[PDB]
Symmetry: D3
Subunit: 87 residues, 6 copies
């Protein structure tokens, strides 16, 4: 960790909390992933059907959801690790 | 009964189950955020050398909760599939 | 609505406010959509031209704008609906 | 003032001006709806104080503040798309 | 002219200097993002084992670039101080 | 690093790149911080003045700016570190 600027040492309490966040994060993210795959297969069956547009939009929205979830976990983990804030 | 909300389409049992599964997992993570928040706040309240760090962590958990709610809203929207005019 | 966890019944007042917010959101959204179609048509004509990358960048930025707008509306609608906030 | 003084800025055109101002016109329209709802919740909270719905009103105010921020970001990105500044990265 | 844009206000020498200071520093970081992106891209283009990893980092650097431009826009907005109707 | 779920070991190339990102981030963040302090003092001199509202708004905007910058950095750093991505 010392090689990385602003990083501080781990502690047992921090490791547990960070892994608890990540575990719950992954649980939700895998739900997003399963829904994504479902939408993908449905879109793949007929790209010119009425619902194709709707399926494509749902894929984009689930990609947004995954991005937001990773940001939420990174902010939460940052709060726990309590890194040196220069600004 | 006719749909009262602009762009809303009807529910289906499959959509309800999926949306409630998203929200269930969302709240589970959100309650972890809430617990860490209360812990930090309590520390701050009883604080010392780390007061600044505690307040920054509180601000960052507030952001985390906001991002999580946005994650859930986008995913439930994707399942609901309301009319997307743009 | 009661089938969705955290949801509350609709009221005439909430329906009017929510609809008003969406109405305005769609208006702006349609402006974004028209500008998007313009750049798309420009790319159709331009192809390999000097401004192709600029049109593609504006397309990406309008996609971002659309995303932002939807998030604004969602947050506003949430404020009006007032669901149970568990965290 | 001169846009040329700002790094990456390019000259305006009638077309861009019209489009940019159309975005901002529609943006402010929605923002004023947010502001009206915000003021309504603010007054309700002023009146409510210790009442049971106080937490709901305060959360609604926080969420409308987020909504306003997102709308300005949406406008900014759309306007940037029309202006088409130099994009170094 | 700035007056043609709704809500815009006149520049000042101080504002110009601060806005360009933000944009300058923004670009330095952005170019670092761009260099890393091109490196990942060349790696993918000429490749294998970590293809998925390279593609993922390209997506994450695209996000990073977007966040940076938003950071700059907000900072620049703060300096310019346009009319804020809401 | 191996105690944190999803983390992979560091390498010298990674360390250098991540710290280069962080250095450039802080440089911009300190500019944001300097502007924030300037606006704060201006607001503190006359909180009932006509421009107090504008200064206050500028402070909120800078705060948002700082938050975006840290997110930019975290995403870039994540890209370089290349942790295990389960979803
Ligand atoms: N004080 C302190 N803070 C830390 C430490 N490790 C991370 N942090 C902070 O938490 C942020 C989020 O970590 P994350 O696990 O949720 O996302 C991390 C993680 O996904 C990835 N990352 C960090 N170290 C990694 C590593 N060894 N291996 C693989 N991936 C790694 O890059 C993300 C962003 O790193 P960052 O430095 O820019 O922001 C950290 C950083 O500010 C740490 O050891 N000490
Ligand atoms: N086709 C369809 N789409 C729906 C329906 N209900 C919601 N949606 C969509 O999913 C979005 C996210 O829902 P959320 O539950 O994750 O966050 C919702 C939810 O938290 C809250 N909300 C909506 N209806 C509510 C209600 N009755 N009661 C309490 N809160 C409510 O407001 C949020 C945003 O509403 P929104 O309309 O702008 O976007 C919806 C909306 O576009 C629906 O019934 N049918
Ligand atoms: N080629 C080009 N691109 C422009 C020009 N003006 C703006 N842009 C781009 O559009 C972005 C968003 O514009 P906005 O009106 O929606 O937000 C603006 C606006 O709210 C404020 N701003 C810009 N010029 C201003 C000005 N004279 N006076 C008051 N406020 C001003 O700051 C934001 C712009 O910050 P930015 O420079 O980082 O991003 C611009 C910038 O990238 C321009 O004249 N030429
Ligand atoms: Ca009162
Ligand atoms: Ca009063
Ligand atoms: Ca009283
Ligand atoms: Ca000054």
């Amino acid at each position: 960790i010392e090689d990385i600027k602003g990083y501080k040492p781990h502690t047992e309490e921090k490791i547990g909390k960070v892994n608890a966040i990540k575990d719950a994060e992954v649980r939700l993210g895998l739900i997003f992933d399963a829904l994504y795959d479902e939408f993908w297969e449905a879109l793949d069956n007929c790209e010119d059907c009425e619902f194709a547009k709707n399926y494509a939009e749902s894929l984009d929205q689930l990609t947004i959801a995954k991005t937001k979830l990773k940001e939420a976990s990174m902010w939460a983990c940052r709060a726990v690790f309590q890194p040196e804030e220069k600004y």
